[PDB]
Amino acid sequence: SRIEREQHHLIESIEKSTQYMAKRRIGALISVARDTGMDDYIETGIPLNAKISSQLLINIFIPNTPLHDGAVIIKGNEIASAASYLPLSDSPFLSKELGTRHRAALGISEVTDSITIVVSEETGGISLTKGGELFRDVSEEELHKILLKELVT
Ligand code: NA
């Protein structure tokens, strides 16, 4: 039950935090590492190695705070780092309305098998990137279905 409880708790933490930040137009960028190691990007951020919670994710992305300027990276059972760097995609197909967070989430999805969640600070929509593809402005049910299928083993 250990592995499943942690993965479900991760999904619930992402859902609750993203809902909180989308309601307040708080920009967020959360990348969940999988098979492809993301240690190179983890080292670019502030190390946390913290237990996963929605409360911590919310506190990290509060605007104009030391931990918010960058991406959160989740590795296994922990929030590995915050304010981490993610590479900007070169793709000209990404819409110009989308900001730097979507391009960074797209960029990391092109070079890793990670699942990255984006909360737009301009629109409040939640977006997903995976394998160089973008799911823009997903609903609560769509986000729940995608996270369950991808993050639960
Ligand atoms: Na486009």
Cα 34 from Cα 97, distance rounded (Å) = 29
Task: Show me where the domains of the chain are located.
Answer: 1-153
* CA 97 to centroid of ligand 1, rounded, Å: 9
CATH class of 1-153: alpha beta
Amino acid at 46: I
Q: Which residues crowd ion ligand 1, with CB under 5 Å?
A: 93, 95
* CA 72 to centroid of ligand 1, rounded, Å: 26
Tell me the resolution in Å. 2.0
The encoded tokens of residue 13 equal 């933490």
Which single residue is written with the structure tokens 């098998």?
113
Cα 143 from Cα 138, distance rounded (Å) = 6
- Rg (C-alpha) for the chain, rounded Å, is 14
* CA 95 to centroid of ligand 1, rounded, Å: 4
* Residue 27 annotated in ligand binding: no
Q: What is the largest CA-CA distance in the chain?
A: 44
Q: Compute, in degrees rounded to 10, the torsion defined by CA atoms 63, 78, 41, 150.
A: -100
The encoded tokens of residue 40 equal 């190179």
CB 74 within 8 A of CB 45: no
Q: What would the DSSP string read from start to end of 66-118?
A: TTTSSEEEEETTEEEEEEE--PPP--S-S-TTS-HHHHHHHHHHHHS--EEEE
